[PDB]
């Protein structure tokens, strides 16, 4: 079909619908789509691999779309919880030349007797940005630990309120994971019951420090169900990434100020 083509028929689309994120940026290309947004001053990402579509096909340089088509609607609003009840399928077809591509989104709802009505009242058309640059995370973390809903809920409870009281994810020797602040402190065991988190490269102790306490708001909006907590410190500015293990892989990088010590 048209040159770059991303199709979600049913039964792989059900995973993507199962996976704030409307006024976003959609950096499509090879290896998939990256959905980037800024909430509260932090950078939140949602990768969507090329294997993770019923058909993903790309020809040309990567393209980047604002999600708000005509500044209200959204190219991801299709994948919402209950926006279109009877939806089955979406195709994203891109057609143009490298400085100017446009992407069109058609919708397909189930009928009886195995067919689909195209809701041509609500198809979307966007134009490739025609100038953009994003700053995506890179490399791999220093040490990453997997958590759960109750675990992650309580560690987010431990963290601060405003700039007065900076928090710190130190990991001590032989399983002293700790997310404290002055007047609240929580701790886990790191294995390679109920405070025994699993992870890898657990020997890599530190004590990171954050000055900006928007982590709680940020990661509560996305309603993360517990996931990876990844630390990145071989940069002048350490950053911590958080990736829910629920239906989605929605991640959020938070910048830990340069005051890195163990």
């Amino acid at each position: 079909g048209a040159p770059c083509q991303v199709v979600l028929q049913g039964a792989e689309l059900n995973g993507i619908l199962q996976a704030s994120l409307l006024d976003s940026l959609l950096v499509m290309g090879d290896r998939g789509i990256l959905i980037h947004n800024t909430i509260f001053g932090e950078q939140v990402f949602l990768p969507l691999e090329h294997s993770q579509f019923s058909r993903y096909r790309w020809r040309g340089p990567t393209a980047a779309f604002l999600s708000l088509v005509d500044q209200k609607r959204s190219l991801l609003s299709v994948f919402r919880a209950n926006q279109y009840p009877d939806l089955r399928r979406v195709e994203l077809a891109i057609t143009g030349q490298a400085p100017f591509r446009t992407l069109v989104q058609r919708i397909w709802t189930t009928t009886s007797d195995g067919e689909a009505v195209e809701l041509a009242s609500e198809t979307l058309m966007k134009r490739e940005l025609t100038s953009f640059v994003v700053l995506v995370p890179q490399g791999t973390p220093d040490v990453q630990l997997r958590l759960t809903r109750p675990q992650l809920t309580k560690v987010l409870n431990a963290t601060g309120a405003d700039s007065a009281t900076p928090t710190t994810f130190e990991l001590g020797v032989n399983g002293k994971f700790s997310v404290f602040t002055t007047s609240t402190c929580v701790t886990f065991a790191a294995r390679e019951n109920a405070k025994t988190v699993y992870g890898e490269n657990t020997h890599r102790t530190f004590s990171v420090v954050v000055d900006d306490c928007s982590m709680r708001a940020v990661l509560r909006r996305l309603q993360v169900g517990g996931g990876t907590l990844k630390f990145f410190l071989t940069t002048p500015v350490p950053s911590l990434c958080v990736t829910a293990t629920g239906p989605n892989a929605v991640s959020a990088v938070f910048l830990l100020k340069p005051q890195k010590i163990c």
Binding site: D30, R31, P61, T62, L66, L68, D70, Q71, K72, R127, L129, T130, S131, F132, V133, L135, V136, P137, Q138, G139, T235, P236, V237, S239, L255
Partner: protein, 739 residues
Amino acid sequence: PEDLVIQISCLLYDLSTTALEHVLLFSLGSCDLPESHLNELAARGLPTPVVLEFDSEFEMLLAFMTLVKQYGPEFVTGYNIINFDWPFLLAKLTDIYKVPLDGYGRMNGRGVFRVWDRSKIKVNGMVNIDMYGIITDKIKLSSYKLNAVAEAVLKDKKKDLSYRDIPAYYATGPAQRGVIGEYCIQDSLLVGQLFFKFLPHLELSAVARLAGINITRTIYDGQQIRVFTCLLRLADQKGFILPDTQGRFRGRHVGYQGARVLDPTSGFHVNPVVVFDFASLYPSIIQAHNLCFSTLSLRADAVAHLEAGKDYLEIEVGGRRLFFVKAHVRESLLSILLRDWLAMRKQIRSRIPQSSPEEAVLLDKQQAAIKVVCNSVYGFTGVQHGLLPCLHVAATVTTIGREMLLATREYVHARWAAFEQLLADFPEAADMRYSMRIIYGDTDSIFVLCRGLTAAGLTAMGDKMASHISRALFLPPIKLECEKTFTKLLLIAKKKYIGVIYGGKMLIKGVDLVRKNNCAFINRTSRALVDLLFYDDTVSGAAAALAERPAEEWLARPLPEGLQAFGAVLVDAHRRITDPERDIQDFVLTAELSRHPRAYTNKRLAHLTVYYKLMARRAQVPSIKDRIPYVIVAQTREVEETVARLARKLLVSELAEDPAYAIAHGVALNTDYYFSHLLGAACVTFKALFGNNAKITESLLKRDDVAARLRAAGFGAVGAGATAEETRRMLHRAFDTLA
């Protein structure tokens, strides 16, 4: 009794030769005028000041009134002499000294010597022309202080003495009292210059001569007694009589339906926009259609013996059928009346060049006067509980006005829709090459956006178009005429637009650069922006490019590469607003009081706030139509506590200091407010570029600290600031870095 008059300057000109004859200075106590001032007077040829010294205030005021009686100046003037000078003096002479002024006019007694607070004054046989009121209706200024008016009209940077500095001076010897006397004389010399620039007596006497009222009723009593007297003359000739109704008589509400304001196709129009409009619209309707009281018939019997359409007009006004019989049945008093005024309007202009230099100046003030009577007729009929009203005539005038605006629009849309029909009417269009759509209109004007036609000869054919329309549609006294041609127009809103007339001047119509609210800072930068938009090419290109996208697409995309200088001005203004020299005369807002501060219902206005702050500190309380200058001072814990003391985030009506205070006490300005209002003025104007979306415009005008720390964190950039290969190779580095 202790707040006394100290000096009275009194210049005595000759009204005919305009020659200053005497310069008198009444002075309580010694007064030695400085030599520099005496020599400036002798240098300019002016008489030498005759300083008269007194012991007591009563003697000084008695000698002033004695001169007023003996010399008996037929005309008196001054600046603000009806709100301060005469009320101050007369309050002294009646309250304190109990002098009867009934004989100090021209009659030896039993004459009127009274002030009213417009605030009038009626001395008998003495025509008081306060130049304050003459200048507020001949110049649009934010401040009408005599220094600002002197600079703006006379090009005379005067030095003002503030009343707070007069006690310190007066206490010293005669030499400082002489300094006060010099500032007094110079004020009156400036007012004499203003009077002889404007020559209000000549224009107002042309009006008094034509109306039938004396000159003092012309200066003071309003527009209705002129019309009533002119009508009364006509009526008494024709055999009519004007009933009294008002003799038994005494919220944005309206009496009848006004005029039509077509919907603008807002936006930046870089094509020619011919502006037709009717000359003397409503007077021409009154004359064309023979509208009057004496020609109206509410009932269809009075005309039951007359042909319809041939002997009488019949029009639905307010859902009431109204019959206005035509001339050759009865000449509508209002039509007859207007014929004379309209004839003089054009006649004088034609014979102005055919006159002496002095006679040309006479026809200047005189003709301008005959233009006031033309529009005065319409208001007379539609004033409710005014003298001799008829809202049937006034509503008929506006009804025909609305019909004509639409009739003209439909004629233009039907006849000249294709260029062949335009060429058939006007062969001179052949060298001017399309569409021709009215994109705006107002009570009489229509803005015809002529696409495909050159702006060069478009007014010369617009005259012929206008004659064509006026011949085809309207009755003889009515006349549409092409008055402008904009080579660029920014139709902002209904009564708002900017546009550069053809090969020429900028016309700014009600877009707050022409409004007396704002501070010179916001006006200066707003003007800078509109000059960029209109004159500076490569910003008119970018601005005309902004319409190729719907407004919300600019919230995502980078704005066209020309408009950058349009934000450089804003950026500079942001710098300039915070800079700590910030002379706060650039930041002085104003507002007119316009009614007693008790007659407001919304008493939470900034100028009322500052009015009461001025009356609280015993400073000079403004008058009902003064302008009340004020700054918006920064919200500070002290200001907060003071406002609650006189009683969060304070309102702008509670951060409403006046500039004299805010300099004396070094109160600092509210940078937040003044910049938000700078951007507000920019947004109000330039929302027309962005689909009239003030929201989108605001966002795009208010358009680091993330890119910094990312470049610090070893993220390379991929996009603008590198060659395309460098962005590709870094994109490779990222994709293999994540994978």
